[PDB]
Amino acid sequence: LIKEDMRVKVHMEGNVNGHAFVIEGEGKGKPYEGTQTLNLTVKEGAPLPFSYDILTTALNRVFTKYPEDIPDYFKQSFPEGYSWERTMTYEDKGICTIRSDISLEGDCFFQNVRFNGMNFPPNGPVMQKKTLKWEPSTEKLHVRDGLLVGNINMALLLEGGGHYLCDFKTTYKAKKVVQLPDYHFVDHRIEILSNDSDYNKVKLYEHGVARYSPLPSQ
Amino acid sequence: LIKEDMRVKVHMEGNVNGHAFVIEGEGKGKPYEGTQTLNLTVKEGAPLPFSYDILTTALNRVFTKYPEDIPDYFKQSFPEGYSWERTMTYEDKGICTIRSDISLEGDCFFQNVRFNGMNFPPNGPVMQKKTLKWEPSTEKLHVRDGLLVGNINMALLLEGGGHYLCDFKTTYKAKKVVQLPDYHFVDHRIEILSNDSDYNKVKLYEHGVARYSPLPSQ
Amino acid sequence: LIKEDMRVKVHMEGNVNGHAFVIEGEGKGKPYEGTQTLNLTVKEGAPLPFSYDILTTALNRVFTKYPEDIPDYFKQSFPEGYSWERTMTYEDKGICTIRSDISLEGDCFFQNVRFNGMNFPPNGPVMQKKTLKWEPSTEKLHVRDGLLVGNINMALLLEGGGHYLCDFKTTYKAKKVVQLPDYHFVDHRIEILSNDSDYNKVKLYEHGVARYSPLPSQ
Amino acid sequence: LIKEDMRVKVHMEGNVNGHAFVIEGEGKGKPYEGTQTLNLTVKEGAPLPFSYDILTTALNRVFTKYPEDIPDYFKQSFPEGYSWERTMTYEDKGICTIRSDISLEGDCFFQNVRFNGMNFPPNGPVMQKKTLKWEPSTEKLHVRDGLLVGNINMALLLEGGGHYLCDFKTTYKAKKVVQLPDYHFVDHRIEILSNDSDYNKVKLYEHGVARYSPLPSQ
């Protein structure tokens, strides 16, 4: 069962372009409002030689405000929970493969993540740390082989203006049989609120809202 | 100048998996409300042996409702007008390349379209006409090298359920200096209203509304 | 019937990055040795404002040396002949879509080609005529849905050294049911032998040989 | 220094579709003939719930027959050794991300491999163990930014005929400055010689020979 208030614990082990790191996060959030706050410490491989932004979207879709007219795959999936696998394909041919396991114990979700980035241009914006933020997005989700699949045309705002684009592919896998939703959208905004200079401590925010098209069928 | 009521003429010369066609349209629209309808006659290639859906997004973003806080790339471009180039990339590895030129004489927008589609599996949804409709969508639009570029995750709803995915990339090119918008989103719904069973005659409708994130910054 | 010696006529209508063109071609070759020569005249849109190398591979696998034990898809297809569709995807996101209809009247093959290119960066290798030649190549051919399909990792050698890569995908389609080959390979070399400085007049040569792996199976 | 006979030790940590595994290889090979064998034992995660064939090509290019006219990038890298990064991108949108380190102690090459596979369809041929073998291949190698890069059009033969395509991209990184080869080819054949039906015990063979085009220039 999910309360209007909930706690989040995150562990991430990763390698990006040969560099190894660990990240731990203590957080809270409001699942039914689609909002969450997360306090992240770089535990190993400080200082990071790449943009913290690439990591943020691997740092739960339980925290999405779902209209009643659209079945909530992620919330239904508990107490057993769900896992997801993501492919982040950037335009400079940098690739990240990410796997998260989402388990519940009491007031606290536990997020267990594996981050693999490689083939990022060394003089490119991720390894040169020129990303300011992710642009807010719209995930498209549908059913493929009894699973939920999300697709997002994503964009990072660069220092000096312009965008660096990433194609976002997630397969969400519930551990119990759940009621499948039809083709819907989720509006996101991912925001780093505070950080230190090495991004050794970061505070992260996420707002997610499930919807149908606002435009009338005919 | 663009009135509240404007007329639309459309010429399409096209080729899908070897088959050559010409489709003529007469239509009308409300540019500032972001809605329009088009009456489509197949002049050559009747009957068509592939889903009409693949042609529909090619059959003018002037018919996009633009809020005052976002500059309108498409309306500013007139009187000289604009052009666009598009790649549609399907999951079965069918592919379309499209080029459109948008002129304005008096109240009428003329659209000249060259449509190419190939490597569509012959037992694939498109050549078997097993596509019911396009899902509603959300195009993300950024400025790259002074031009406006859109990316859309798109899905066709098939018989038996299931969706058939496509990656939309558009490059829009004003034939004039115009004020350039910040990163923004256009929500879309395209639908076929009426058709004979050969789709030789089709009535097409589109609704398009531009916006920033509905979710607020923190 | 295909003789040791045959003639080749070539009509290509095209458009690259907005620039239209027409290229006529009379030529000859030895089908059973997989060698041929072609004399190429630019007839419209001279001089071409882009590298001629993109076009050359679109200017007939009938000129392939086929060992006894691999069926010859192309040669079998005649008299009725065959057609092909090709995708050229360049690493800088230039994209060419090409169709060729291959017919036989007497001892002369007619090749009717439609060539479409778009999204070549204006400062890019293709639009800045900075390519020397195609590296020789190995095509891989497999049967998919009762058609023959080819994939080639191709490279254009650049002025100043280094390579500009391009993923090659051809779908060949005989107009007759022919005996389908097993998975096999075609070794390629294509060469511009002679040209004037605007490439308005080009002499083109290709050598193609089909084989299995030379490596013994354990 | 490499001798006509050398030994191989392999430690692969891996996760495919969430299922983790460890494999230990002991094997031998003949570096200047391009031939090698391996004895593979699944030490964790037996039985593997996916096709073994996807793991086989990550289980040295030191064991490649290199002519004198083509510099040997991999044999020059020792005594210090080389690392490699690979992308395997399947047509069903399955993806593997691999990384290897090659060390030499005495007469034995130590290969340390990390394997990540994900978004493999659950009814797909990988997850349904329906892959008979890798077809023989021809890799194409060029220098990009003072590193050697490999591209292969790879196919798995499918039980019930037909093929399952993969795009291989490998970036090899010598840990010492070496002589850089010109654009060349390496012909490959990988073959599982013997296996228990669960594949917990597997014997592996690979042949690899470097060449130029066998077709004369003009």
DSSP for D98-118 reads: EEEEEEEETTEEEEEEEEEEE
What tokens does C156 get? 């254009």
Q: How far apart are the first and last CA of chain B?
A: 40
Quote the minimal CA–CA distance from D151 to chain C in Å.
7
Quote the minimal CA–CA distance from A25 to chain D in Å.
22
Q: Chain A contacts of D99, Cβ < 8 Å?
A: 15, 118
Rounded Cα distance, B19 and B50, in Å: 9
Residue D122 preceded by cis peptide, ω within 30: no
Nearest to D91 by CA among C149, A86, C163: C149
Q: What is the maximal distance between C-alpha atoms in chain C?
A: 56
Q: Which of B15, B18, B85 faces C118 most closely, judged by CB atoms?
A: B85
Cβ-defined contact of D209 to C191 (cutoff 8 Å): no
Cβ-defined contact of B85 to C119 (cutoff 8 Å): yes
C176 burial via Cβ count (<10 Å: 0-12, 13-18, 19+) = exposed
Q: Which of B144, B153, B213 faces A153 most closely, judged by CB atoms?
A: B153
Beta strands in chain B (DSSP E): 6-16, 19-30, 35-44, 82-90, 95-105, 108-118, 131-134, 137-144, 147-158, 163-174, 184-195, 201-211
Categorise residue C129: left if φ over 0, alpha if ψ from -120 to 50, beta otherwise: left
Method by which this entry was solved = X-ray
Cβ-defined contact of D143 to C162 (cutoff 8 Å): yes
Rounded Cα distance, C155 and C90, in Å: 9
Measure CA B136 to chain center: 12
Rounded Cα distance, D88 and D77, in Å: 24
Cβ-defined contact of D153 to C151 (cutoff 8 Å): yes
DSSP lists the bridge partners of residue A22 as A13, A44
Nearest to B170 by CA among B61, B65, B26, B39: B61
Quote the minimal CA–CA distance from A164 to chain D in Å.
21
Which of A183-216 are b and which e, b meaning 16 or more Cβ less than 10 Å from the residue's Cβ?
bbbbbbbbbbeeeeeebbebebbbbbbbbebebe
Q: Chain D contacts of A124, Cβ < 8 Å?
A: none
DSSP lists the bridge partners of residue A156 as A134, A164
- Which of A36, A206, A207, A213 best probes binding to B when mutated, by most B CB atoms within 10 angstroms? A213
Rounded Cα distance, B142 and B214, in Å: 18
* CA quadruple D194, D197, D200, D203: dihedral, nearest 10: 10
Nearest to A142 by CA among B95, B137, B214: B137
**Mapping DSSP to helix (H, G, I), strand (E, B) and coil, where does residue A9 land?**
strand
Which residue of chain B has the CA closest to C121?
Answer: B145
Question: How many domains are there within chain A?
Answer: 1
Pairing of strands B108-118, B6-16: parallel
C67 burial via Cβ count (<10 Å: 0-12, 13-18, 19+) = exposed
Residues in D lying within 8 Å of C, measured between beta carbons: 135-138, 140, 142-144, 151-153, 155, 157, 161-163, 165, 167, 183, 185, 187-189, 191, 193, 205, 207, 209, 212-218
**Mapping DSSP to helix (H, G, I), strand (E, B) and coil, where does residue D54 land?**
helix
What tokens does C103 get? 């017919």
Residue count of chain B, please give it: 218
Asked if residues B185 and B138 have their Cβ atoms less than 8 Å apart, the reply is: yes
* CA quadruple A30, A35, A41, A46: dihedral, nearest 10: 160
Asked if residues C59 and C23 have their Cβ atoms less than 8 Å apart, the reply is: yes
Asked if residues D46 and D198 have their Cβ atoms less than 8 Å apart, the reply is: yes
Q: Which of C153, C217, C218 faces D151 most closely, judged by CB atoms?
A: C153
Asked if residues B160 and B188 have their Cβ atoms less than 8 Å apart, the reply is: no
Dihedrals φ, ψ of A75, to 5°? -70, -50
Say how many CA atoms lie within 13 Å of A208 toward its Cβ: 23
Rounded Cα distance, C54 and C165, in Å: 12
Contacts of D177 (CB under 8 A, 6+ apart): none
Could you give the C-alpha distances from C202 to C8, C23, C155, C157, D24, in angstroms and in order? 15, 10, 21, 19, 57
**Mapping DSSP to helix (H, G, I), strand (E, B) and coil, where does residue D55 land?**
helix
Cβ-defined contact of B118 to C85 (cutoff 8 Å): yes
Pairing of strands D108-118, D6-16: parallel
Residue count of chain A, please give it: 218
Cβ-defined contact of D99 to A147 (cutoff 8 Å): no
Asked if residues C90 and C158 have their Cβ atoms less than 8 Å apart, the reply is: no
* B87 among annotated binding-site residues: no
Residue spans of alpha helices (H) in A31-181? 53-56, 73-76
Cβ-defined contact of D144 to C167 (cutoff 8 Å): no
Dihedral angle sign, alpha carbons of residues A39, A44, A49, A55: negative
Which H/E stretch holds residue D73? Answer: helix D73-76
DSSP B86: E
- Which of A96, A101, A112, A116 best probes binding to D when mutated, by most D CB atoms within 10 angstroms? A116
Type of residue at D126: V
Q: Which residues of D are annotated as a binding site for Mg(2+)?
A: 54-55, 57, 88, 94
Q: Chain C contacts of B116, Cβ < 8 Å?
A: 97, 116
Rounded Cα distance, A137 and C161, in Å: 41
Q: Which residues of C are annotated as a binding site for Mg(2+)?
A: 54-55, 57, 88, 94
Contacts of C177 (CB under 8 A, 6+ apart): none
Q: Could you write out the three-class secondary structure of chain C? A: CCCCCEEEEEEEEEEECCEEEEEEEEEEEECCCCEEEEEEEEEECCCCCCCCHHHHCCCCCCCCECCCCCCCHHHHHCCCCEEEEEEEEECCCCEEEEEEEEEEECCEEEEEEEEEEECCCCCCCCCCCCEEEECCEEEEEEEECCEEEEEEEEEEEECCCCEEEEEEEEEEEECCCCCCCCCEEEEEEEEEEEECCCCCEEEEEEEEEEECCCCCCC
Asked if residues D118 and D88 have their Cβ atoms less than 8 Å apart, the reply is: no
**Mapping DSSP to helix (H, G, I), strand (E, B) and coil, where does residue D72 land?**
coil
Rounded Cα distance, D122 and D143, in Å: 37
Say how many CA atoms lie within 13 Å of C72 toward its Cβ: 23
Nearest to A48 by CA among A40, A37, A39, A36: A40
Dihedral angle sign, alpha carbons of residues B22, B26, B31, B36: negative
Q: Chain A contacts of B138, Cβ < 8 Å?
A: 138, 140, 185
Residue count of chain D, please give it: 218
Cβ-defined contact of A163 to B155 (cutoff 8 Å): no
**Mapping DSSP to helix (H, G, I), strand (E, B) and coil, where does residue B74 land?**
helix
B112 burial via Cβ count (<10 Å: 0-12, 13-18, 19+) = middle
Which residue of chain A has the CA closest to B134?
Answer: A183
DSSP B54: H
Q: Chain D contacts of C162, Cβ < 8 Å?
A: 142-144
Q: Which of A138, A193, A209 faces B138 most closely, judged by CB atoms?
A: A138
DSSP D4: S
Rounded Cα distance, B67 and B65, in Å: 7
Rounded Cα distance, B205 and B34, in Å: 11
- Touching chains, A (3+ CB pairs < 8 A): B, D
Residue count of chain C, please give it: 218
Asked if residues C128 and C160 have their Cβ atoms less than 8 Å apart, the reply is: no
- Which of C33, C90, C138 best probes binding to D when mutated, by most D CB atoms within 10 angstroms? C138
* A54 among annotated binding-site residues: yes
Pairing of strands A108-118, A6-16: parallel
Which residue of chain A has the CA closest to D88?
Answer: A95
Dihedrals φ, ψ of A93, to 5°? 65, 20
Q: What is the maximal distance between C-alpha atoms in chain D?
A: 56
DSSP lists the bridge partners of residue C47 as none
Rounded Cα distance, D199 and D203, in Å: 9
Asked if residues B24 and B103 have their Cβ atoms less than 8 Å apart, the reply is: no
Q: Which of D15, D83, D85 faces A119 most closely, judged by CB atoms?
A: D85
Q: How far apart are the first and last CA of chain A?
A: 39
Quote the minimal CA–CA distance from A181 to chain B in Å.
12
* CA quadruple B32, B37, B42, B48: dihedral, nearest 10: 100
Rounded Cα distance, A165 and B183, in Å: 12
- Residues C45, C47, C48: CA angle, nearest 5 degrees: 75
Dihedrals φ, ψ of C209, to 5°? -130, 125
Rounded Cα distance, C23 and C200, in Å: 9
Quote the minimal CA–CA distance from D142 to chain C in Å.
7
Rounded Cα distance, B63 and B8, in Å: 10
- Which of D35, D37, D133, D140 best probes binding to C when mutated, by most C CB atoms within 10 angstroms? D140
Measure CA A183 to chain center: 20
Dihedrals φ, ψ of B127, to 5°? -80, -15
Which H/E stretch holds residue A7? Answer: strand A6-16
What resolution in angstroms, rounded to 1 decimal?
2.6
* B131 among annotated binding-site residues: no
Could you give the C-alpha distances from D18 to A11, A83, B95, C24, D117, in angstroms and in order? 16, 9, 32, 57, 8
Rounded Cα distance, A185 and B212, in Å: 15
DSSP lists the bridge partners of residue B20 as B15
| Domain hosting residue B1, numbered range | 1-218
Rounded Cα distance, D109 and D107, in Å: 7
**Mapping DSSP to helix (H, G, I), strand (E, B) and coil, where does residue A144 land?**
strand
CB atoms within 10 A of CB A217: 10
Residue spans of alpha helices (H) in chain B? 53-56, 73-77
What tokens does C105 get? 């009247």
Q: Which residues of D are annotated as a binding site?
A: 54-55, 57, 88, 94
Rounded Cα distance, A148 and C193, in Å: 55
Nearest to D177 by CA among D42, D73, D63, D104: D73
CB atoms within 10 A of CB C105: 10
Residue spans of alpha helices (H) in B29-165? 53-56, 73-77
Cβ-defined contact of C116 to B123 (cutoff 8 Å): no
What tokens does C64 get? 């392939």
